[PDB]
């Protein structure tokens, strides 16, 4: 996570069997070892709730930092569930509106750069 928030780091071994990480392995101790399709995650406990993704990992496992103070990994939450009562004799209509305003940012041009070939490749040598 951000160095401002904390300093606790966790390691991820890519596609290495957590059943074989004893061959692979202060963080080499078995404290909270989790297994993902992306590999073996060491240094973060596992949580069962659902949150939005903050730092992607792989196979949908998303990790975050929440408080005592440690790193967690969880199933990424597609969003809050919702359902709508379909029926063929009802209609739902708005009765009030809202004028919102949103910002879109587009790059246009980059820095007009030029390069001197001979100077950069040879300096000031006649040879």
């Amino acid at each position: 996570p951000g160095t401002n928030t904390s300093n606790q780091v966790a390691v991820l071994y890519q596609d290495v069997n957590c059943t074989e990480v004893p061959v692979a392995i202060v963080y080499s101790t078995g404290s909270n070892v989790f297994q993902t399709r992306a590999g073996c995650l060491i240094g973060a406990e596992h949580v069962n709730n659902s949150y939005e993704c903050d730092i992607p990992i792989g196979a949908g496992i998303c990790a975050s930092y929440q408080t005592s103070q440690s790193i967690i990994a969880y199933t990424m939450s597609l969003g809050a569930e919702n359902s709508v009562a379909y029926s063929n004799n009802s209609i739902a209509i708005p009765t009030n509106f809202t004028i919102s305003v949103t910002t879109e940012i587009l790059p246009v041009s980059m820095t007009k750069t030029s390069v001197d070939c001979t100077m950069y490749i040879c300096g000031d040598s006649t040879e």
Binding site: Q14, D15, R37, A38, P56, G58, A59, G60, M76, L78, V84, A85, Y86, S87, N88, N89, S90, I91, A92, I93, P94
Partner: protein, 99 residues
């Protein structure tokens, strides 16, 4: 590609989204397109039936809606047969997914 490349440094990082979640997104998009209309793409959604959704969609090409209600049965049969035709043509095509 089986294992030789995986044993020469070449790794394949798995995609961020699994197939099931993508299927869930597509199911959500279909649910919104069926029970809501175009509203759910602009904030909160509205519930509104299906026949009186095409009844408004036909207003968007140049034919007034009374056509749909006067030909509901035929149009239903035609749409179902069209879906079946997609299913069978996809079922019996050797090379239709070159792209």
């Amino acid at each position: 590609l089986i294992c030789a490349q995986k044993f020469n440094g070449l790794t394949v990082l798995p995609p961020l989204l699994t197939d099931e979640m993508i299927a869930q997104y597509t199911s959500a998009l279909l649910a919104g397109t069926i029970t809501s209309g175009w509203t759910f793409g602009a904030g909160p959604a509205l519930q509104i039936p299906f026949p009186m959704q095409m009844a408004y969609r036909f207003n968007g090409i140049g034919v007034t809606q009374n056509v749909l209600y006067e030909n509901q049965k035929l149009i239903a049969n035609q749409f179902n047969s069209a879906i079946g035709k997609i299913q069978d043509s996809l079922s019996s095509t050797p090379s239709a997914l070159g792209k």
